[PDB]
Amino acid sequence: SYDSSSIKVLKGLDAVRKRPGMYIGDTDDGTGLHHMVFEVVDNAIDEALAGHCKEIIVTIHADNSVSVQDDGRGIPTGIHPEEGVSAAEVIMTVLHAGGKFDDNSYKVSGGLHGVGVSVVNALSQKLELVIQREGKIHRQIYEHGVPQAPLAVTGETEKTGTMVRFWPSLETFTNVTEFEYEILAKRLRELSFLNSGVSIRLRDKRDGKEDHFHYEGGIKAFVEYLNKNKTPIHPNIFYFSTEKDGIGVEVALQWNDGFQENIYCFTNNIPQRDGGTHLAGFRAAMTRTLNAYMDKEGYSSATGDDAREGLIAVVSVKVPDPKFSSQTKDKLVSSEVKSAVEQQMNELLAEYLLENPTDAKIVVGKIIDAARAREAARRAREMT
Amino acid sequence: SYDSSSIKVLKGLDAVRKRPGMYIGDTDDGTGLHHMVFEVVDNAIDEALAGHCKEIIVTIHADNSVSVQDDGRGIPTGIHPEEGVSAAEVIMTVLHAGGKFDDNSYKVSGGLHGVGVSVVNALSQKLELVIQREGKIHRQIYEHGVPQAPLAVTGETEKTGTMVRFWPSLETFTNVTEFEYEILAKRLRELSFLNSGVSIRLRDKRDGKEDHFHYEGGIKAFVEYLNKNKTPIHPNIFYFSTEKDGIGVEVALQWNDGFQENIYCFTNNIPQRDGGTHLAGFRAAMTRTLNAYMDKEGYSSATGDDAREGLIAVVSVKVPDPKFSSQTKDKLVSSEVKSAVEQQMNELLAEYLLENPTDAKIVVGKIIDAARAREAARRAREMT
């Protein structure tokens, strides 16, 4: 019998536990498990983007929990009048709740859905929250998303910051249930490059391993790092950072003598594994600008794929209200970012090629060689 | 100042309008716009999967609205006691609400989040709902997700079904704002193949164009259709349908003399553009089973990619509670589906090759030729 009693409304965090895939991704291969950490880290990075956090400490504990401490402003603790509990508890227990729906608290933030840490909470057997704010230490414990007691003051402090420690629920996560140091370290190293001036520490209490990431030089240095064990073919890394029409665009790139393409795209410091409009704009400007240069200098018919071979690039955009296809933010679907990146790249890459004739000549050589190899592969295929 | 008044909770459907990308996808290139239709169509298909709907009519109206009529059971109309309004209104105005959180109303369904038609409503300037149920016609109008009046009886009927007509909000959708016949027709043709016995009609009132899709022969015929304007190299399409361990697995495939691979994956009739665990299991069993056959018959070192060239396949699984990474359901992230597909394929594909020696020999020839062409391309590349 199909009638009004067949219709169910899921309340609070029940939807997250019921359908974890739409909130955290794959709960079996480890990627969802580590995403729990990255949600908490993204909130600390957002305090760093806002200018308030200079140190982040990520700890893998020996009982398979993870903690993240930041020295930012602290999650607000005052009573939220509408809901009648502390703003921190609203944040931990209510979907689509937070301080990133306008630009008053965070001008630019990776966060935008009001869901992230509420997901972490919902999918954790236990979560510990410690907040340092307004001279006071506040603490609260959750079990499966349920607060055990109201947020309470436990003492005094000169400091500000937020600490979240969580133990993931094995009723949700299967197969890969332990944290992998190198997965966390990769992401934290990249965040250090993206956030100059912010100390990021990683500690593993299982084995005593630790890292301290504090690179200077930003994404230009990130490109150097990524070519470290490769062989760059030209010495001058192309780089710019601009802020035009409400949108920050920062690009670095360099070709090496290998045959792979590795472009890393980020929006408000969140990676897009599956690319998006920023990558589409980057590719479009590279193809245009190189073809124009080869035409003006008399070297020209290669395509956009021949520009790929040997490329390492980082594209990092800063956007007031970006649009992603999912909570995991694997893909950027904001059309005006395609145009901002394309426009800035066309102008600054053309200047780069004019100002660095030796590099330009080497890169043209590489593109031509890629095209020559592509055409020979094709003829060889046809002939078998 | 960052404090508890900085924390905002979005209510009702406000979150959908605020962050449409996580609910509908890209609101500028047309893909989100057409997804609005497919959400409504998916709900009618779910009535068809359940055995209650034999006809679906999709109409593109001349004012740029779309309607979908089905002859299923009808959206329940009785008052939902907890919320105090009709179950239909709860469905249209509340996220994570519906009848697909257990298997009592729909054994198997594409739907699972309780979000789809509430998203359509939230992002529509206007929505018209007409429900035929229990001898009565019920009607309600929404504007920007807001009901204008409570659901009302308007007359009598011998029929059952649901009709939804919506006008998409241009405050949300940009650039591609008109419906494209061929986008809808492609999806509806594929749903006809996936749902034998269900009449699917498409009508465009802008120009009088119409289609009636009612293919028989199912996914085996779908593979024939997809090779129609190509040249299959062997006459016998591989096909099976089984239901083992709670999971339905149905596969059809055939090689052609071209060089592209086109695998179409579906879970409860919803396509996965970005693949997933069903595709991973399909690839794994193909590689294993073909290598075993080539080893036993003495033809063997090709890889999994050489099995790709010329392949057309459809993989359709039926799963009680699948896991997707997003509301748009582009990717299946359920580990036990990888194993069900892999296991069923290994057993039935090996039988197929034994029972059809002429086809097996042709397919082995094709795999070998693909490998030969791959190796020649590689040597040619190296030498430039």
Ligand SMILES: Nc1ncnc2c1ncn2[C@@H]1O[C@H](COP(=O)(O)OP(=O)(O)NP(=O)(O)O)[C@@H](O)[C@H]1O
């Ligand atoms: N470490 C932190 N320091 C200060 N405020 C924080 C911190 N973590 C969370 N918050 C606050 O809690 C809110 C909710 O966080 P969260 O549930 O992650 O959603 P969000 O960051 O706003 N968006 P999203 O992560 O994309 O879902 C944030 O918007 C902040 O207002």
Ligand SMILES: Nc1ncnc2c1ncn2[C@@H]1O[C@H](COP(=O)(O)OP(=O)(O)NP(=O)(O)O)[C@@H](O)[C@H]1O
């Ligand atoms: N055409 C229909 N006929 C009968 N019942 C329907 C129909 N459309 C919607 N419903 C009911 O309305 C509920 C909510 O639909 P919807 O908001 O699309 O979510 P869902 O189909 O359950 N899941 P999802 O589409 O994955 O978000 C369904 O679960 C059904 O109970």
Ligand SMILES: [Cl-]
């Ligand atoms: Cl009812």
Ligand SMILES: [Cl-]
């Ligand atoms: Cl406060």
Ligand SMILES: [Mg+2]
């Ligand atoms: Mg967040």
Ligand SMILES: [Mg+2]
């Ligand atoms: Mg639905």
Ligand code: NA
């Ligand atoms: Na914001």
Ligand code: NA
């Ligand atoms: Na169900």
